[PDB]
Amino acid sequence: KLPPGWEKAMSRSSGRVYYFNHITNASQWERPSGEPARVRCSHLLVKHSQSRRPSSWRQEKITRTKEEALELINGYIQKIKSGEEDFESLASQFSDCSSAKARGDLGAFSRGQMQKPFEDASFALRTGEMSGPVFTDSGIHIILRTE
Ligand SMILES: CC(=O)N[C@@H](COP(=O)(O)O)CN1CCC[C@H]1C(=O)NCCc1c[nH]c2ccccc12
């Protein structure tokens, strides 16, 4: 059992079992629960100095380090999981992609269209699920599967 990518792990603080997905970098306490032709996702992208294109609508020259980008991503994930802020609101404000203007929506796509790590993560998510930090040449993503 356990859907594609999902793995059982041991909490270092609690000793309690949790579940981690090595394709999406999602992690959760609850036990997870065939791959479709197309999926629809939104994303929030945080670029860094090592991004293939180190600029965005947010800032002409992106200078933060990959490590600093990951901290931001982790912070947004915390805000989303706690309900303090919703994904769509953070994507509109903070994503270094033009899709920010559409609350992060990329529309529907099939395999063979996106960068591979993004694609694999997108197709490993079930409808409604969100990834952890996903790394591509563009930067670091949080991905939400909407369809
Ligand atoms: C371009 C964009 O809107 N954002 C990119 C910003 O990153 P750069 O500044 O380019 O490095 C980041 N993309 C979004 C997720 C992965 C990445 C990607 O693979 N784009 C290919 C675009 C693409 C190909 N067919 C699609 C079908 C639907 C939607 C998008 C696409």
UniProtKB/Swiss-Prot annotation:
It comes from the Eukaryota. GO terms for cellular component: ciliary basal body; cytoplasm; cytosol; glutamatergic synapse; midbody; nuclear speck; nucleoplasm; nucleus. Changing residue 55 to D/E: Loss of peptidyl-prolyl cis/trans isomerase activity, nuclear localization and cellular function. The keyword Oxidoreductase does not apply. It is found in: Nucleus; Nucleus speckle; Cytoplasm. It comes from Homo sapiens (Human). Keywords: Acetylation, Cell cycle, Cytoplasm, Isomerase, Nucleus, Phosphoprotein, Rotamase. Residues 1-33 form the WW domain. This is Peptidyl-prolyl cis-trans isomerase NIMA-interacting 1. SMART domains: WW (SM00456). Peptidyl-prolyl cis/trans isomerase (PPIase) that binds to and isomerizes specific phosphorylated Ser/Thr-Pro (pSer/Thr-Pro) motifs. By inducing conformational changes in a subset of phosphorylated proteins, acts as a molecular switch in multiple cellular processes. Displays a preference for acidic residues located N-terminally to the proline bond to be isomerized. Regulates mitosis presumably by interacting with NIMA and attenuating its mitosis-promoting activity. Down-regulates kinase activity of BTK. The modification Phosphoserine is found at residues 55, 92. Interacts with STIL. Interacts with KIF20B. Interacts with NEK6. Interacts (via WW domain) with PRKX. Interacts with BTK. Interacts (via PpiC domain) with DAPK1. Interacts with the phosphorylated form of RAF1. Interacts (via WW domain) with ATCAY; upon NGF stimulation. Interacts with PML (isoform PML-4). Interacts with BCL6. Interacts with FBXW7, disrupting FBXW7 dimerization and promoting FBXW7 autoubiquitination and degradation. Directly interacts with RBBP8/CtIP; this interaction depends upon RBBP8 phosphorylation. Its EC number is 5.2.1.8. The gene is PIN1. Phosphorylation at Ser-55 by DAPK1 results in inhibition of its catalytic activity, nuclear localization, and its ability to induce centrosome amplification, chromosome instability and cell transformation. Ser-55 is dephosphorylated upon IL33-stimulation of dendritic cells. It catalyses: [protein]-peptidylproline (omega=180) = [protein]-peptidylproline (omega=0). GO terms for biological process: cellular response to hypoxia; negative regulation of amyloid-beta formation; negative regulation of cell motility; negative regulation of ERK1 and ERK2 cascade; negative regulation of protein binding; negative regulation of protein catabolic process; negative regulation of SMAD protein signal transduction; negative regulation of transforming growth factor beta receptor signaling pathway. The WW domain is required for the interaction with STIL and KIF20B.
